[PDB]
Structure 1
Amino acid sequence: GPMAWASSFDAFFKNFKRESKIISEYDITLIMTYIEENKLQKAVSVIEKVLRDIESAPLHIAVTGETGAGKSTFINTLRGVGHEEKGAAPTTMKRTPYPHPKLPNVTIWDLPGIGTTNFTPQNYLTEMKFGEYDFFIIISATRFKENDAQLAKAIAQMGMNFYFVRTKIDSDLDNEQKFKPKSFNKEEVLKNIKDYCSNHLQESLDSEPPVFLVSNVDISKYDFPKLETKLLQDLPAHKRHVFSLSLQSLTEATINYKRDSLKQKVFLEAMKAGALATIPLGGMISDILENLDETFNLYRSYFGLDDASLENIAQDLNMSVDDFKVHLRFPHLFAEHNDESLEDKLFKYIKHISSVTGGPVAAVTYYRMAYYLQNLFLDTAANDAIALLNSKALFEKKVGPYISEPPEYWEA
């Protein structure tokens, strides 16, 4: 009943990383208050408004910095757009929008360097429509300018978030290794660049800013993963979903941010639809799977598992997409294996999933069968995306017929 539903809602959200939660701790408190106080309609109204916010949330990112800093390349890398493609930022004194190719409501803006302009910091922000943005990225390939520190100070005074991004770190490291092959120390180079930049910036700021050292040519390396985590941490909870969807699927961490965001969203949808007192029946599973077809194709698109995206990795292993797909779990996820019935496997899965946030004592909270099928597909899709990152190596060491880990609780 109500008290079991509130405690299982709290237990569900406790399982996620702090920077991944798509609702605030106050949203959680308010939903639990209404459920515990027998105000179930008020609880469902909060959840509906949260889902509307999450689903309609725009994301506008301002990227500012001088010419030669790798700003175009950064804007393209963030969007997953190749340098030669249509929509690519080309590789000069108004702001330019670059829409995300795959997500309507996400725009990366190219702002000209304040140093290109004769404006004060305050007036530069008015001119560039500062109110439109979720945060600012201040990019340099060198050291920063007093110019950048003053702009950051102005942004902080408007109560908004900025991040100093130092590009081309891979080029500086390569040059030093070639210069000093016997005494090269990567960590010393990184510390010396970060320290120079933060020490000069702080001369005009409240406290020591973090500087993120990145390579625009590999978003997996250096401080780029730390930057993605900080950007999530600092966003409003409701904007973390669209930002997670905007990330590449090029690291296990980014795949897991997408997996976690989507699992939270489909749980909220399940709450909105309503808790059930008994395990849902499997009589109509093919009809429920057919109703989810568009959804499962969307999930494939998010994880890079659509047929078009599989072509690149398959030629890479020098095999056909079809041969690669034999070794992935998502195609045959809802197929009978070892003559175990799909309904019996789902009944077992539901008992585990509902035991994880319910435990052995209190009334069990069940949801509609569609919730469990979505949850299962998302875990499978993510585990298939992780395996694609290391396919060559996984393929050699045949750890069974699939290269991916099984989705939690499905196999027995």
Structure 2
Amino acid sequence: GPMAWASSFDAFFKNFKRESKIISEYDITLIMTYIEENKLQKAVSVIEKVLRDIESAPLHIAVTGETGAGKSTFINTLRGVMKRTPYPHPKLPNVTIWDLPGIGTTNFTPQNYLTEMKFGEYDFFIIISATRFKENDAQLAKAIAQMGMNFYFVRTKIDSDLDNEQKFKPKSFNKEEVLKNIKDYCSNHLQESLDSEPPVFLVSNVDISKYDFPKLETKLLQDLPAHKRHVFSLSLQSLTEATINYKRDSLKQKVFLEAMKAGALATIPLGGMISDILENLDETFNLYRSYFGLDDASLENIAQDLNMSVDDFKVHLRFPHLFAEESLEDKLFKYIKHISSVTGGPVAAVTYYRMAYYLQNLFLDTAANDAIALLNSKALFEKKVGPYISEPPEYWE
């Protein structure tokens, strides 16, 4: 009883990368304590409080740097698009990317710049440069860290410098040597002023899949408070498998907690059929489609590149057909048996909410696999219908 539901709870959250956990290990420890003491109502009120903090958590990101750093293109690419300027995210009103003028552009000291730019409103600072980070940049970072906050040095316009070098020396172009020289110069000069060797993230302003942008996103996740990881995961653009999987895992944890909130303690059965639960979940499912870029509007462009209609293209995606007919409820019985033999399942006494949980979990895993397929839509289809059953040799194809 009590001891077994705490182990399922523990075993569920053990399955996730450390930087993706939306509750802290203290939260988990508290919740497990109450479950083990047979205080499930107390455990539920903790989960409710956690979920309220998660759902209302705002995200304010300060991007500080000079105008030559392409700050505008950087900010638009984050959002999928002497005074600070806000740029709300187009899909998430509670996310705001702020354009902060370069400290060198102003004439403030670091401490005065921070107070002028309202440093307490932000979750972290991005210090951006298209060139090298000056000693004033290092002084700013030092102040930010003294305020107990986080900063990240981002060197942008990497694609422009590689292009110039490539056109300069087409036959001896060494991509990795350019990157190493750029990063080392930036690192070595920040190390002299700053107490520790700060990481420097090399990025393209127009393509967040490239260079160090993936490692940046992982470090930002890892440094944020646990409850802020969900809204930050949602704010990412679903353009890499890692980013898609960050969203998948964050939403899977959230629906697990929602299941316990709604169904750990309810006891008169709600009744209905699986078809009724699915009807009730229809708007939730559409919200999930929107998180993953699977809504009809987003699927139009991709279907065109494949000379298909959205209806055609959706034949080859799994989420539309997940529930059909071998009956559905037998498929679900076996699914539940598989999962709950492994991680115990959700803490949900109410069948309605137990099944809502599994239906949402399944939809989330499917939507994420579909989104991953969208990254390489044409090639996947062309390989699928074409004859070859195996992968091509390395540099031939």
Q: In which range does the TM-score fall when normalised by the shorter chain?
A: over 0.9
* Distance in 1 (alpha carbons) for counterparts of 2:348 and 2:319: 34
TM-score by length of 1: 0.90
- Out of 225, 237, 247, the position equivalent to 2:214 is 225
* Distance in 1 (alpha carbons) for counterparts of 2:222 and 2:365: 23
- Indicate if the aligned counterparts of 2:78 and 2:236 stay in contact, CA closer than 8 A: yes
Higher helix share: 2
What SS does structure 2 have at the residue aligned with 1:119? coil
- Indicate if the aligned counterparts of 2:348 and 2:354 stay in contact, CA closer than 8 A: no
Change in CA separation of 1:218 and 1:282 when aligned onto 2, cut-off 3 Å: farther
- Indicate if the aligned counterparts of 1:5 and 1:35 stay in contact, CA closer than 8 A: yes
Change in CA separation of 1:405 and 1:227 when aligned onto 2, cut-off 3 Å: farther
Change in CA separation of 1:405 and 1:34 when aligned onto 2, cut-off 3 Å: farther
Q: CA deviation at 1:356?
A: 1.6
Q: CA deviation at 1:362?
A: 16
Q: CA deviation at 1:33?
A: 1.0
* Distance in 2 (alpha carbons) for counterparts of 1:77 and 1:223: 15
Change in CA separation of 1:73 and 1:144 when aligned onto 2, cut-off 3 Å: same
- Indicate if the aligned counterparts of 1:380 and 1:407 stay in contact, CA closer than 8 A: no
* Distance in 1 (alpha carbons) for counterparts of 2:252 and 2:396: 16
Which deviations, in whole Å up to 9, do the C-alpha atoms of 1:365-390 show, x marking residues without a partner?
A: 99621001100100010000001111
Q: Which residue does the alignment assign to 2:246?
A: 257
Q: CA deviation at 1:228?
A: 0.5
What SS does structure 1 have at the residue aligned with 2:269? coil
* Distance in 1 (alpha carbons) for counterparts of 2:159 and 2:284: 39
Change in CA separation of 1:294 and 1:361 when aligned onto 2, cut-off 3 Å: closer
Q: CA deviation at 1:181?
A: 2.1
TM-score by length of 2: 0.93
Q: Which residue does the alignment assign to 2:345?
A: 359
Change in CA separation of 1:295 and 1:6 when aligned onto 2, cut-off 3 Å: same
Change in CA separation of 1:385 and 1:359 when aligned onto 2, cut-off 3 Å: closer
Which deviations, in whole Å up to 9, do the C-alpha atoms of 1:150-179 show, x marking residues without a partner?
A: 100000000000000000111111111222
Q: Which residue does the alignment assign to 1:374?
A: 360
Change in CA separation of 1:173 and 1:73 when aligned onto 2, cut-off 3 Å: same
Q: Does 1:30 align with 2:15?
A: no
- Out of 344, 347, 368, the position equivalent to 2:330 is 344
- Out of 364, 383, 392, the position equivalent to 1:397 is 383
Change in CA separation of 1:277 and 1:53 when aligned onto 2, cut-off 3 Å: closer
What SS does structure 2 have at the residue aligned with 1:368? helix
Q: CA deviation at 1:274?
A: 3.2
Q: CA deviation at 1:391?
A: 1.1
Q: CA deviation at 1:275?
A: 4.0
Q: CA deviation at 1:398?
A: 2.0
- Indicate if the aligned counterparts of 1:21 and 1:240 stay in contact, CA closer than 8 A: yes
- Indicate if the aligned counterparts of 1:99 and 1:108 stay in contact, CA closer than 8 A: yes
Q: Does 1:187 align with 2:173?
A: no
- Out of 246, 252, 261, the position equivalent to 1:272 is 261
Of 360-369 and 109-118, deviating more is 360-369
Of 307-316 and 169-178, deviating more is 169-178
* Distance in 2 (alpha carbons) for counterparts of 1:13 and 1:402: 40
Change in CA separation of 1:168 and 1:406 when aligned onto 2, cut-off 3 Å: closer
Unaligned runs of 5+ in 2: none
Q: CA deviation at 1:410?
A: 36
* Distance in 2 (alpha carbons) for counterparts of 1:73 and 1:237: 29
Change in CA separation of 1:404 and 1:52 when aligned onto 2, cut-off 3 Å: farther
Change in CA separation of 1:362 and 1:122 when aligned onto 2, cut-off 3 Å: closer
Change in CA separation of 1:226 and 1:403 when aligned onto 2, cut-off 3 Å: farther
* Distance in 1 (alpha carbons) for counterparts of 2:22 and 2:151: 21
Unaligned runs of 5+ in 1: 82-92
Q: CA deviation at 1:399?
A: 7.7
Which deviations, in whole Å up to 9, do the C-alpha atoms of 1:297-350 show, x marking residues without a partner?
A: 1000000010000001111112111111110011111112xxx11111111111
| Within-5 A mapping of 1:108-147 | 108-147=97-136
Q: CA deviation at 1:401?
A: 14
Change in CA separation of 1:105 and 1:388 when aligned onto 2, cut-off 3 Å: same
Identity %: 100
